[PDB]
Structure 1
């Protein structure tokens, strides 16, 4: 068999547009008229945008056209918005109560601008020190593209260890968000002059600095 054939990746520029192809067979795509498309965000609930070749369902803002030509269905994203960057699956009934899917299409937008991260360094919560631990968090957010690197320092001489760094997530403005964090002991973080968080993105370093100076 196949599963409805899609092109692995499809793409457009902002305001431009793309047409996805779902290709099946006379048993499914041709035959019945029940091709729905699924927009799935990166590892997320899949939501349906088209149900019956073209059919407007709950809040599918913008140009999300469904059109099938015989044995091949297709959808379009006229006037590209960046939120549309996702994964698109199609589906057709095949009979005896079954539905088949399409092999997916990763859909990316182009022309989305560059953005350097929002670096927010955080000192250990009073509570967490009362509890005897101490964690420092660096929140790197609102950056595009999602490629970044985080350093930590004791004083200028670096701390290469006890740092756990997140791999970035798209957040609802398309921009990415990553976390970096240092596990210390109270004693440690009292016994230093300044810790810092270096963040490098598109060859642009931000450097936030945290020193034990908390009104806690």
Structure 2
């Protein structure tokens, strides 16, 4: 399964050396060094910039580098160049028949100040409840770059179920808005204690929690 976890945004200025880690798990733990690093610009099919953890294919600018130990492979961009802005991925062969991919590090050559995400959690209103409908909305506003992660916990227990997340969208202030939503049932929302929207932005992580109350 795609057990190769990667940082969302990765960003820098022309010059500094942006790194892009990639983690995973199990089997022959870190016993496979089939880690391959790929760039892709927004309109292209994915260039392979590295492989066999430490290897670059014919040419590939010696400022792109690789590294790996335990559970973490890394791709350091030693001296960011303007056209280094792109999507970046990890890949690992789980065994024969198997190929595991990363989540992607959108790397941005910073135009603005790096903006840290405003997150706000809303629970299903009285009325929606009155309609046998349960939706929660985690508005994520104002980040830069538009590259975030969202994880929903129910009583701290990270549920992989009914939820979506919008794409980040350049607001009229060039900051990115997104939306993760969760769709529940007044039984399961009542039959619980707490609901977390855990949002992360390279080098940060919020978790705002809403608790079920009543009135009606």
Q: What TM-score do the two structures reach when normalised by structure 2?
A: 0.50
Q: Which has the larger radius of gyration?
A: 1
Asked if the contact 2:198/2:206 (under 8 Å) is kept, the reply is yes
Write the distance in 1 (CA, Å) between the matches of 2:60 and 2:26: 29
Name which of structure 1's ranges 79-88 and 129-138 shifts more when overlaid on structure 2: 129-138
Q: Is there any run of 5+ residues in structure 2 with no aligned partner, and where?
A: none
Pairwise CA distance, 1:20: 0.3
How far is 1:85 from its partner? Answer: 0.1
Greater Cα shift, 12-21 or 175-184: 175-184
> Structure 1 unaligned runs (5+)?
none
1:183 aligned partner: 183
Label 1:153 to 1:63 Cα distance change in 2 as closer, same or farther (>3 A).
closer
Instruction: Name the Cα RMSD after superposition.
Output: 13.0
Give 4+ residue runs of structure 1 displaced > 2 Å after superposition: 26-29, 110-216
Q: Is the 8 A contact 2:8 2:202 kept in 1?
A: no
What is the count of residue pairs matched by the alignment? 216
CA distance in 2, matches of 1:27, 1:210: 37
> The residue matched to 1:105 in structure 2 has which SS?
coil
Q: Is the 8 A contact 1:23 1:29 kept in 2?
A: no
Identify, as 1 or 2, the structure richer in strand: 1
C-alpha separation in 2, matches of 1:123 and 1:214: 11
Conservation of the 8 A alpha-carbon contact between 1:29 and 1:72: no
SS of 2:132's partner is coil
For normalisation by structure 1, the TM-score amounts to 0.50
Structure 1 203/96 Cα, relative in aligned 2: closer, same or farther at 3 Å? closer
